[PDB]
Structure formats: structure tokens, C-alpha cells
């Protein structure tokens, strides 16, 4: 069950128009307030004209519109449920612009919502592009439009939110498919529920940024309900998804063939563990007592080439536990893991105590000191975020989280940890003056220019309650050691929400909820367009282009040569991301030091240490003197 961001606009004076209406199922039966009457397009004697069908509302005055909702017919007949759809707003009823929301609604009879940033408008149009089962018709028992209490124009310079992407599931986990550019998402055995799973099934959905298409696919071949998993992209270019609702399983998502492949069971049953890809392309995981039982779950390691997991019992979980009020059940969850040099994995929190993990022999763990600064020792920060914004200098930015997983006040703590060699205690300092808004359950991504975007969360973590929401994102800019608030959004993104960097340099931020018939399921996502894509008039800036690359698969240590259609000042590599439960151990950034060959031709070296340039897929971005990034070119990095 979902909910709208607004309050329903009274419909007494509306005029509505539909492409067709069966008599008895007139256009205005969708706004008579009777749930047992519906609008329905032509069928029968009138022929069965096919979608797109269109429902247009003239609301007579300008309202501060922030959603609409559609109640399907309730007579047990599925005909005319809306699948693909687009929502447009207009002030003259003639010029509609770009959709403020689009995507697909799940095929059943529950009320569907489109939630989007407030926009003043007098006319609203819903286009039903497909029917949910492929049939000719559209029907709707009640359509409502919602408004916010006010409207404030976004401020120049601080980015923009929108459009909304409407989805058939809550995307509580997601990954970019690097070879196609699509956003892959999944929930669990149900579109919005995880409890009582019979195991064996994951609902997935994908959004294609370049066609805007949302599709879906029910995955049973890996016999894995993947809610609550570790996620890493391995050196063979496959995404390893572990445990969760089926605590022993491994599923492999292969972006090239766009398919799922069974992997070998883990040695230990786990849920809510973090896994991290290693400098040799293998994947390490540790902890995870959400499923498979509560007990000490020390490290293990997955080998893509031999397809085995092997236990590393001396990579001990004890040193990284938090003091969670709930004990080991929570206290070994969501470690801030980063693969680093020579097979090591750094654990940056959420526990105060940071640790080196080693994966030779049966494993090892070594204290790396406490996360702290001149302001004191940092407390446990369960579901705080950690992001490696400069792998070449070992820089990790950490921020937010709370001492307990849930029912717990979040903080504005933030640190910069600087990694050196494995086994040495890194320098950690406070980042700037901390976050503007205390938050937990927020998500974050490093952006092409090295800044880190931070969004959503709530001030006090109370899972599934969209209370104390934080609507204003922050960006940390490391060269200034400063945070900057960005334009706010209107959809709560708290527990079970995700963010990822898209190839076109925008941020995709969605989910939140996945709690059954709770009222806080967000079956959607929105795009955030950072300010670096706008010129100083607030139009989209012209972006440099990479017109050639000399290779798109390179070995650590190797050079790449590019041509561009114009001069570039900076370049960076950003490793593709994956995301669930605040955790993303896949993204990281490498700033590139460019050789200018002349004529808009440049080279750079991929760092030769593959604990820095972790093997897998990376995005190459180049930025012009104005700071505008290109869209990414995909580079596979090997070792």
C-alpha cells in the first residue's frame, strides 16, 4: 500500500476529457467519488481501440500539484489496469512539456500513485501507454490530484529534482548494469513485502535511462529471494548477490548476457552482511546475522574463477561489532568495507573501532584505531555511509548513522579517513563542521568531480516510519572541505532506500519502505541533476564529448588515450555502483592525471595497484573548464 505526498484537490468544478468512453463508463465516472463506477474506454459495439489512452483534467485554477493517484476498477475484472504511463502538467492545457512522472504500475487492483516535485499547474494529464496485461482498454474507478501546502521555486545553483520514475516494486536494492546502462532493482518475493517469504524468488525491475522504459522480471532460476543481501561486482564483471532471505545462496548477475546465473552457496548463512570486491577480483564478506541465525560469522571469500566460497575463520567479526542495543543480531550488519591493497579489506565502521581484514591463509584482522578526531572518539554509526572519493590518496568520507540500528537518534558526525598501507592506523579527521542534517538510512554517491552527494534519511531512525525526514541533500566538496545543501525534494527516502550514480552523471535515488501493507512503500525513484550540468541561466549546459578511446578494456598500470570534441580540464574514473541498506562497497573514484597530447587528445595511466583501481567496470568522465562532465565511457579494468 502506498501514499501520496499531498492533499486531494476538491473536484467539484473539474472538467475532464478522455480519448474515448463507453456509455455507462463515462469519463467523469472517474471523479464522481463512487468507487464502484469507473471510466472505461470503448469496447464491444464501439470497437476496442488500443492504448495510448488519455485522461485530461482541467482543474479551473492553478494548484501546487505534487501527485495523482488512480484507483483501478474494484469489480474483480482486470480489464484496463494501467501499465506504462506518463503524467504531464500544463498551465494552458495545450503545451504539456516533458512528463513529470512516467514508468509502470504493478498489475493488480490497488491504488497506484505518481508522486513528484510540486509544480504549479491548472491542467493534468495521465496517459495510459499500455494496459497492464497488454489488452486494448483503460479504466479508472477514481482519479485524484494532490497539492502541497505551498510552492517554492528551486534555487539557482543547487541542482534539480525530477522526473519521478514510477515502478511496479519498491527498489530496496539496485545496481547499474554497466554494459547496458540500465538501472537494475529488486525487492523480494513480493513487490513490497519480505516477511513470510517461501524462499526461491526475487521480483526485479529495470529502468532504462535512455528509453525511459521500465520492465520487470521474476527471477527463480537462482532459487534466491535476494532481499537483504551482500552485493559486490567481482573482477569477472559479475554482480555477486549473497544471502538475505535465502541466507546461503549466491546469485550472479551478468550484465553482458543480461541474465542471472546460480553461484555456489556461501559457507556461512548470512543476511545484512556487507561484501567487498578485492584487489584480485575475489569478494570478501563478514558478519550478517539478519538471516541464517545469530552467531559469530567470520569472514569468507568467493573466487569467480573457481566458483567456490572458502571460509576465513581467522578474519574475525568480533573486533568490528557495534554495541547495538539488539546485540549480534544487528551489531555485525552493513560493515563499511573497502577492498584495498594486497587482498586486504578495510572496515571503516559503523563500529567506532576500525579494522584491517586480510585474506591470505585462513584470514586475519588487525586493529586500525578508532574512528575519531580532535572532537572526540566517534560513536557507533549504524547505517552511516562511507564513500571512497579518491582511491588514489586513500580518502574515505564517512557521515551520519546512529548508535543503534533503529529507534535511535542519528548524528551529523562526519570524518575523512586517509588509508595508507594495510596494517597501519589511518589518519582520521572531522570533515568540515559535520553534516547540515543529522541522518540515518541516507544514501550517497561520489560524483565525477570528486564531491559526494548525500540524500534522504531521517533524524531519528524508526524503520518504516517516514517521520523526521530529511528533504535537503548535501554535497561535500573535498577541495574546500565544505558541505553545501542542495535543492530539497518531496519524497521521503529513509529505510530501504538507494541511490546510484547514472552513466549520464545524474543521481538515481529511490525506494524506501518495503513493509507490506504499511503506508510508507515508495514504488518509485527520482532523478537529481547536479548543478554542474546547468549553465548560469539554469539551462542544461553543453557537455564535452569523448569521441574516441584507444581501448575499453585495460589492465591496471596500462594507458588509455582519448580524443574529445573540446578541451578538458579534468577526468576521473568512477567504479560502477551497487546499493542496498546504505551500503555500496562497489563505487569509488580515481582522479586522473592527464597527459595533453595536443589537438584535444589526452592520455592517462590506470593506477597500477589493483587495491586502488579495483578490477571491474568503471565510468570514465572528462570535465571541461566550466566543470561540465561528459556522459561516461565504459572502461573494463582488469588485473
Interacting residues toward Ca ion by CB under 5 A: 29, 32, 34, 37, 141-142
- Sign of the Cα pseudo-torsion (47, 48, 53, 55, in order): positive
Q: How far is the CB of 34 from Ca ion (least distance, A)?
A: 4
* Nearer to Ca ion among residue 21 and residue 172 (C-beta): 21
Q: Round to whole Å and give the CA distance between 252 and 180.
A: 16
* Nearer to Ca ion among residue 16 and residue 335 (C-beta): 16
Q: Round to whole Å and give the CA distance between 604 and 192.
A: 45
**Residue 151 marked as a ligand binder:** no
**Residue 442 marked as a ligand binder:** no
Q: Round to whole Å and give the CA distance between 483 and 416.
A: 13
Three-state SS letters, 378-436: CCCCECCEEEEEEHHHCEEEEECCECCCCCEECCCCEEEEECCCCCCCCEEEECCCCCC
Which residues have C-beta within 8 Å of that of residue 415, sequence separation ≥ 6? Answer: 371, 372, 373, 378, 397, 398, 399, 428, 429, 430, 431
**Residue 43 marked as a ligand binder:** no
Q: How far is the CB of 37 from Ca ion (least distance, A)?
A: 4
For the chain, the first-to-last Cα distance in angstroms comes to: 47
Write phi, then psi, for 419 (nearest 5 degrees).
-75, 135
* Nearer to Ca ion among residue 27 and residue 214 (C-beta): 27
All three cell numbers of 523:
514504488
* Nearer to Ca ion among residue 13 and residue 95 (C-beta): 13
CA distances from 505 to 103, 174, 531, 633 (A): 21, 17, 11, 11
Residue nearest to Ca ion (CB): 37
Check if the beta carbon of residue 356 is closer than 8 Å to that of residue 425: no
- Give yes or no: 88 in active site: no
All three cell numbers of 535:
549553465
Check if the beta carbon of residue 594 is closer than 8 Å to that of residue 567: no
Q: Under DSSP, is residue 29 helix (H, G, I), strand (E, B) or coil?
A: helix
* Nearer to Ca ion among residue 71 and residue 518 (C-beta): 71
* Nearer to Ca ion among residue 34 and residue 210 (C-beta): 34
Closest by CA position to 441, among listed 459, 415, 414, 419: 459
Q: How far is the CB of 247 from Ca ion (least distance, A)?
A: 46
Q: Which of 113, 123, 405, 495 is labelled catalytic?
A: 495
Q: How far is CA 38 from the centre of its chain?
A: 36
**Residue 40 marked as a ligand binder:** no
Other beta carbons within 10 Å of 195: 12
Q: How far is the CB of 39 from Ca ion (least distance, A)?
A: 8
Q: How far is the CB of 32 from Ca ion (least distance, A)?
A: 5
* Nearer to Ca ion among residue 30 and residue 240 (C-beta): 30
Q: Round to whole Å and give the CA distance between 638 and 236.
A: 8
Q: How far is the CB of 168 from Ca ion (least distance, A)?
A: 24
Lateral strand order in the sheet of 546-549: 546-549, 559-564, 601-605, 595-598
| Helix (H) and strand (E) counts in the chain | 1, 51
Q: How far is the CB of 102 from Ca ion (least distance, A)?
A: 24
Beta strands 101-104 and 160-166 are parallel
Other beta carbons within 10 Å of 568: 23
Positions annotated as catalytic residues are: 495
**Residues within the annotated binding site for Cu cation?**
272, 495-496, 581
Amino acid at each position: 500500500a502506498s501514499a501520496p505526498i499531498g492533499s486531494a484537490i476538491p473536484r467539484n468544478n473539474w472538467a475532464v476529457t478522455c480519448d474515448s468512453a463507453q456509455s455507462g463508463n463515462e469519463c467523469n465516472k472517474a471523479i464522481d467519488g463512487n468507487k464502484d463506477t469507473f471510466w472505461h474506454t470503448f469496447y464491444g459495439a464501439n470497437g476496442d481501440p488500443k492504448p495510448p489512452h488519455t485522461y485530461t483534467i482541467d482543474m479551473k485554477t492553478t494548484q501546487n500539484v505534487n501527485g495523482l493517484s488512480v484507483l483501478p476498477r474494484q469489480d474483480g475484472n482486470q480489464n484496463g489496469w494501467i501499465g506504462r504511463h506518463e503524467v504531464y502538467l500544463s498551465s494552458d492545457g495545450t503545451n504539456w512539456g516533458s512528463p513529470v512522472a512516467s514508468g509502470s504500475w504493478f498489475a493488480d487492483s490497488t491504488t497506484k500513485y505518481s508522486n513528484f516535485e510540486t509544480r504549479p499547474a491548472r491542467y493534468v494529464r495521465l496517459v495510459a501507454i499500455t494496459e497492464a496485461n497488454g489488452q486494448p482498454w483503460t479504466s479508472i474507478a477514481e482519479i485524484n490530484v494532490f497539492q502541497a501546502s505551498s510552492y517554492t521555486a528551486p534555487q539557482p545553483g543547487l541542482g534539480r529534482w525530477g522526473p519521478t520514475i514510477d515502478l511496479p516494486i519498491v527498489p530496496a536494492a539496485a545496481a547499474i548494469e554497466p554494459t547496458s546502462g540500465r538501472v537494475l532493482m529488486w525487492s523480494s518475493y513480493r513487490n513490497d513485502a519480505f516477511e513470510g517469504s517461501p524462499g526461491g524468488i526475487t521480483l526485479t525491475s529495470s529502468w532504462d535511462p535512455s528509453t525511459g522504459i521500465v520492465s520487470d522480471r521474476t527471477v527463480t532460476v537462482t532459487k534466491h529471494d535476494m532481499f537483504c543481501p551482500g552485493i559486490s561486482m567481482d573482477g569477472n564483471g559479475q554482480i555477486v548477490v549473497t544471502g538475505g532471505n535465502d541466507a546461503k545462496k549466491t546469485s550472479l548477475y551478468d550484465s553482458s548476457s543480461d541474465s542471472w546465473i546460480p553461484g555456489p552457496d556461501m559457507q556461512v548463512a548470512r543476511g545484512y552482511q556487507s561484501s567487498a570486491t578485492m584487489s584480485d577480483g575475489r569478494v570478501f564478506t563478514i558478519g550478517g546475522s539478519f538471516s541464517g541465525g545469530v552467531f559469530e560469522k567470520n569472514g569468507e571469500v568467493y573466487s569467480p574463477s573457481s566458483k567456490t566460497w572458502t571460509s576465513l575463520p581467522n578474519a574475525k567479526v568480533n573486533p568490528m561489532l557495534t554495541a547495538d542495543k539488539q546485540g549480534l543480531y544487528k551489531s555485525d550488519n552493513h560493515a563499511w568495507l573497502f577492498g584495498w591493497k594486497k587482498g586486504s579489506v578495510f572496515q571503516a565502521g559503523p563500529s567506532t573501532a576500525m579494522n584491517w581484514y586480510y585474506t591470505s591463509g585462513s584470514g586475519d584482522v588487525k586493529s586500525a584505531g578508532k574512528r575519531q578526531s580532535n572532537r572526540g572518539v566517534a560513536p557507533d554509526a549504524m547505517c552511516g555511509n562511507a564513500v571512497m572519493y579518491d582511491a588514489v590518496k586513500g580518502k574515505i568520507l564517512t557521515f551520519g548513522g546512529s548508535p543503534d540500528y533503529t529507534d535511535s537518534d542519528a548524528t551529523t558526525n562526519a570524518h575523512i579517513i586517509t588509508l595508507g598501507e594495510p596494517g597501519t592506523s589511518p589518519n582520521t579527521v572531522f570533515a568540515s563542521n559535520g553534516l547540515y542534517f543529522a541522518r540515518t538510512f541516507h544514501t550517497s554517491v561520489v560524483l565525477p568531480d570528486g564531491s559526494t552527494f548525500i540524500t534522504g534519511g531521517q533524524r531519528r531512525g524508526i524503520i518504516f516510519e517516514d517521520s523526521t525526514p530529511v528533504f535537503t541533500p548535501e554535497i561535500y566538496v573535498p577541495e574546500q572541505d565544505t558541505f553545501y545543501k542542495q535543492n530539497p525534494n518531496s519524497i521521503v527516502r529513509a529505510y530501504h532506500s538507494i541511490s546510484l550514480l547514472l552513466p549520464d552523471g545524474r543521481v538515481f535515488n529511490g525506494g524506501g519502505g518495503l513493509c507490506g501493507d504499511c503506508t510508507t512503500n515508495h514504488f518509485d525513484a527520482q532523478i537529481f541533476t547536479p548543478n554542474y550540468l546547468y549553465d548560469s541561466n539554469g539551462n542544461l549546459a553543453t557537455r564535452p564529448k569523448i569521441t574516441r578511446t584507444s581501448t575499453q578494456s585495460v589492465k591496471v598500470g596500462g594507458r588509455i588515450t582519448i580524443s574529445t570534441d573540446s578541451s578538458i580540464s579534468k577526468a576521473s574514473l568512477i567504479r560502477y555502483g551497487t546499493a542496498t541498506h546504505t551500503v555500496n562497497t562497489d563505487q569509488r573514484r580515481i582522479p586522473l592525471t592527464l597527459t595533453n597530447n595536443g589537438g584535444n587528445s589526452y592520455s592517462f595511466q590506470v593506477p597500477s595497484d589493483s587495491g586502488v583501481a579495483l578490477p571491474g567496470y568503471w565510468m570514465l568522465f572528462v570535465m571541461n573548464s566550466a566543470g561540465v562532465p561528459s556522459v561516461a565511457s565504459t572502461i573494463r579494468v582488469t588485473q
